[PDB]
A paper describes a structure:
Here, we report the use of the TPBLA to explore the role of the protein sequence in determining the aggregation of the naturally amyloidogenic protein, β2m. The protein forms the noncovalently bound light chain of the major histocompatibility complex class 1 (MHC 1) and is important for antigen presentation. More recently, two single-point variants of this protein, D76N and V27M, have been identified in amyloid deposits in the viscera or tongue, respectively, with the former occurring in the absence of kidney disease.
Comparison of the crystal structures of D76E-, D76A-, D76S-, D76G-, D76Q-, D76Y-, and D76K-β2m with those of WT- and D76N-β2m revealed no substantial differences that could explain their different stabilities and aggregation propensities (RMSD < 0.6 Å over all heavy atoms). For other variants, the loop structure is maintained despite these hydrogen bonds either not forming (D76A-, D76G-, and D76Y-β2m), or being reduced in number (D76K-β2m hydrogen bonds to N42, and D76S-β2m hydrogen bonds to N42 and T73).
Numbering used by the authors: 0 to 99
Write the structure that this text describes.
Amino acid sequence: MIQRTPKIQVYSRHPAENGKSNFLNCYVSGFHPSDIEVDLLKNGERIEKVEHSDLSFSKDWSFYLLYYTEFTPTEKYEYACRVNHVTLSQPKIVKWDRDM
């Protein structure tokens, strides 16, 4: 068995083909097992209808999830990615750094 704590990166991207659009991304990488719960949060609120949940694995024991959705970040909301994983005794909330 192997278990690997997801690395969690939360960042915003504009698709270059629609630069007006802003995507909050939670890139959850290198985890094993694949079982995971990943949410994007707006304050503590899970963002529903996260448009993209792209799971892949490299090695059979390394999973990568890009979990991202269009969002419109404003000051009034903190955005975060919340990951639960067996390796994470508590949900890991990685705040979107507004500069990221």
